[PDB]
């Protein structure tokens, strides 16, 4: 690693995502996804273990076949009414292939098998940047191409994403796999409301990016991969414990806390449409994806595990880790309940 090379590759990730955002041409959207891939591969393998090798291999294969299936859908779009305009499509087949390519690219339950495996063997900075930008970049495209999608596609992907991201997570004790299963569940939530009012989807994108930044920042502050290490960081610092409490319960989404606002507003502009059994099923699965948060809390801050010494040694040294931006994102991620009418900040 060189810092010049890393800042240049960060600039290329920024450039690729902005080209995905701004370009009215389909080729440049595909080029933006590809440049995002080509730059995000050496963000992984920041170490040199074979873990990152296998992880970047699996990510590259799924990422590349997603990109090529997107190009397939675009060339079918030009087989029909032929112009390079980001608009309503002209085929249920091309829209079908495009939603499946963006579900492979995004992370979705028939295609979600690569996400926990790729998050197991990478450093936390690489996992943070891949989760944030790879859940950011296709949402702009779906926000653009919404008016020509069969809802069976999006809704089956969303329901299955919420229930599989729930049911995975009870058995996994790696922190990265827990965060990845939470990511699959929240992307199901952010996919479900796409054909109804996408302002909710982009606001939930803002909220979830803030939440993931707080989570992986609070795991950058202490090199922890298991919950036993979280008990040792209970022993060495007390304020990390109450922030794990409040931020994990904000991932849980309880009404005094900021993570309830993306669920609640979705249920609002979901039940002004006359589907009701689908909101109550989704929200029962939202009750389901809180237990692994809860046992994570019970490991960290509300029970007191026995601790190894040399924390006796560590108490001399300061907590001199740098934090990128922890407290701003923390209290923005937890205390954003009474700012409900900031929905209108988006459109």
């Amino acid at each position: 690693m060189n810092p010049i090379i890393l800042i240049i590759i960060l600039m290329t990730v920024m450039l690729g995502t902005i080209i995905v955002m701004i370009s009215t041409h389909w080729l440049l959207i595909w080029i933006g996804f590809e440049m995002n891939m080509l730059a995000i591969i050496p963000i992984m393998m920041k170490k040199h273990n074979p873990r990152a090798t296998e992880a970047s291999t699996k990510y590259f294969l799924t990422q590349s076949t997603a990109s090529m299936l997107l190009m397939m859908a675009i060339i079918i779009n030009l087989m029909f009414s032929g112009q390079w305009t980001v608009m309503k499509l002209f085929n249920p087949m091309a829209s079908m292939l495009m939603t499946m390519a963006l579900a492979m690219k995004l992370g979705m339950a028939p295609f979600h098998f690569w996400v926990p495996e790729v998050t197991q063997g990478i450093p936390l900075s690489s996992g943070l940047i891949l989760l944030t930008w790879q859940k950011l970049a296709p949402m702009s495209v779906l926000y653009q191409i919404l008016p020509s999608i069969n809802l069976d596609l999006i809704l089956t992907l969303s329901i299955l994403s919420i229930t599989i991201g729930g049911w995975g997570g009870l058995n996994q004790t790696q922190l990265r796999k827990i965060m990845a299963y939470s990511s699959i569940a929240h992307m199901g939530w952010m996919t479900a409301v796409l054909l109804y009012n996408p302002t909710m989807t982009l606001l939930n994108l803002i909220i979830y990016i803030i939440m993931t930044s707080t989570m992986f920042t609070l795991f950058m502050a202490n090199s922890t991969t298991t919950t036993l290490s979280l008990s040792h960081t209970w022993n060495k610092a007390p304020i990390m414990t109450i922030l794990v409490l409040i931020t994990l319960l904000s991932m849980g989404g309880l009404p005094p806390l900021s993570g309830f606002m993306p669920k609640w507003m979705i249920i609002q502009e979901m039940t002004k449409n006359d589907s009701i059994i689908l909101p109550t099923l989704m929200a029962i699965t939202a009750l389901l994806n809180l237990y692994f948060y809860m046992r994570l809390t019970y490991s960290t801050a509300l029970t007191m595990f026995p601790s190894t010494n040399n924390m006796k040694m560590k108490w001399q040294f300061p907590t001199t880790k740098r934090m990128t931006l922890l407290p701003t994102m923390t209290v923005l991620s937890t205390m954003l309940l009474p700012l409900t009418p900031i929905l209108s900040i988006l459109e």
Binding site: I22, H25, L27, Q83, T85, K88, Y143, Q144
Partner: protein
């Protein structure tokens, strides 16, 4: 979010590649030029649902 840096900074970096019936370098038409001109002017400032129907 489909941003509008394309329209705010004003430099049409991409609008020439986009449709047919643009400024070709040697001024030659495509196969369905007049049909595109009529369809684009039919669905220009229309709300994309009654433009559909």
């Amino acid at each position: 979010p489909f941003f509008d840096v394309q329209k705010k900074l004003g430099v049409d970096l991409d609008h020439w590649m986009t449709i047919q019936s643009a400024e070709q370098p040697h001024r030659i038409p495509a196969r369905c030029h007049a049909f595109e001109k009529e369809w684009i002017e039919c669905a220009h400032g229309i709300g994309s649902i009654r433009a559909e129907k």
